[PDB]
Amino acid sequence: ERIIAFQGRPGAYSDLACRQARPGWTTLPCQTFAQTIAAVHDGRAELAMLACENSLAGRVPDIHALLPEAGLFIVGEHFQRVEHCLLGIPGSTLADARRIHTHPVAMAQVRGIITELGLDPVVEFDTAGAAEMVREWGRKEDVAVASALAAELNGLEILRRNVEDATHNTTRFYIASRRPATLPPPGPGFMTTLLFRVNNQPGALYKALGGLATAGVNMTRLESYMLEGSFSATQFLMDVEGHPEAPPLARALDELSFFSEQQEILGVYPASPFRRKP
Amino acid sequence: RIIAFQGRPGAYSDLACRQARPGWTTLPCQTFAQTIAAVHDGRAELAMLACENSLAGRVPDIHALLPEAGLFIVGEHFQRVEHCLLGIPGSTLADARRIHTHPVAMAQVRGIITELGLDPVVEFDTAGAAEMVREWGRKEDVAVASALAAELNGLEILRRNVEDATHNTTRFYIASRRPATLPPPGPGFMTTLLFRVNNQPGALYKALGGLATAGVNMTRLESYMLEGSFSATQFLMDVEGHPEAPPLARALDELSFFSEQQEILGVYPASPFRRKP
Ligand SMILES: N[C@@H](Cc1ccccc1)C(=O)O
Ligand SMILES: N[C@@H](Cc1ccccc1)C(=O)O
């Protein structure tokens, strides 16, 4: 209660996401995605911040089976423009830096500053760990690339904010809670995430979508999954604008039901203002 | 003759490499970026990249990183994940008190946990659990991991096909450095491609119309956000066929009318696993 679980360690971007999307809430680090969900299921946390999409690259969990099983429900989403800081020890400076420690992907994103300062790349497991290691070692020669939060929590100094050579990466998250008794009341500005299955024949998916197109309903995400021991059908996770008990989505879903099987609502939640921000 | 994979020795990805390319030296890499880098740099011929799981699993996002390493999907592989209960040399089922494995695996083997009255101890992955059980001398600790993990860590298999409650199958892309030409037109091929359509109702629907009426069957489809730009959406699509042969050839020309920046990520044989009971 007032606790939000996330996957990773303190100062991870997921941690920052929690503090961005729910300021004042205590964040609960979990090492595994399964533990993150388990925290909410068991009552150790109210919410879970689960990564779902990255514009460039990232590690995201497969929620298609695990989330409905043990009965979570997407009650929100959150967008994060990932901001890389170059972190050093309290008394350090840019000139001291010789070796740079961070995640493989981050290292690619900051190739400019590596060449600029002539640094030696040292790839670590994640960004938060690189921040922790730089603190632990106490060497001014070693710097980290990690979140500004990782600097705060480990008492490191920010040698430079915004080290990305371009905007590069944005991360989208689902915010999941224990399944609520009723859905949010019909209204504008809602999103809906659902599962459905169609057969393995040419226009099977196409048909299922027909009702969405002619009804003017816009899809924001779609992703297919294999079925265990069957190549005869295919399951889909779909994000669509709207609320299932309000037009124009309500009728569109009735049509979808005619051309699909085992439809299931994973979440009905407010669409983030980030979607309409320049 | 070297194939890179993500994980540590005895991981199911490692087993996949040995299944799909027997006799090839496998190159463990800790990160997905390192796995692709190995092929880009010439440290490996191929890369075994996990792409799908029927139940659950950790898969990389290849949509940007793979084309940008200049790689190209030249094959696929399906693996029915087979869990072995592993103990230290000379141990037995009776000795076992604690059981170590990945969260998902632990769920799949709830039967044997209750059967032997074991204490579940969840680890990061299966290969690590095998390594830990070896490292710790202790007959009280057993692992659930691949048969390969047992071999490479000198552990004994206490039971070979530990029944899963709900089984898992893992699908992989096999990527190499972009070849000069495509495989010659013929039957049994699959094609993976990237395309973009606009953020309007029916945009995707239109792009697919040409596939449906042309009798071309899709096996996978997955959307991605575009950095900044909230105006279009990129898709990865697996479809049956070869882009220089009907019925796919013409279907793709139509798809091009309703989409942008079409790109072939791979053209590769469809695994016999797709038609196996
Ligand atoms: N094979 C079906 C369903 C499907 C669509 C897309 C991806 C995977 C499966 C079709 O072509 O419509
Ligand atoms: N929004 C477009 C394309 C799209 C589909 C699915 C996910 C994202 C984008 C449509 O409704 O057809």
Author numbering:
A (entry chain B): 4 to 281
B (entry chain A): 5 to 281
Publication text:
We solved and refined the native GqqA three-dimensional structure to 2.5 Å resolution, utilizing SAD phases obtained from a truncated and Se modified version of GqqA. DLS and SAXS measurements indicated a GqqA dimer in solution, which is also present in the crystal structure with a rather extended interface area of approx. 2230 Å2 between the monomers. A GqqA monomer itself consists of three domains. The C-terminal ACT domain is formed by a four-stranded anti-parallel β-sheet and two helices. The symmetry related mate of the ACT domain complements an extended central β-sheet structure of the functional homodimer. In the C-terminal regions of both monomers within the dimer interface we identified two L-Phe molecules. The PBP domain is folded into two structurally similar subdomains which form a cleft for the putative active site. According to this data the GqqA crystal structure we analysed corresponds to a closed conformation.
GqqA strongly interfered with N-acyl-homoserine lactone (AHL) quorum sensing signals from Gram-negative bacteria and affected biofilm formation in its native host strain Komagataeibacter europaeus. ESI–MS–MS data showed unambiguously that GqqA hydrolyzes the amide bond of the acyl side-chain of AHL molecules, but not the lactone ring. Consistent with this observation the protein sequence does not carry a conserved Zn2+ binding motif, known to be essential for metal-dependent lactonases, but in fact harboring the typical periplasmatic binding protein domain (PBP domain), acting as catalytic domain. Structural data together with a phylogenetic analysis and the enzymatic characteristics implied that GqqA represents the first example of a till now unknown, third and novel subclass of acylases.
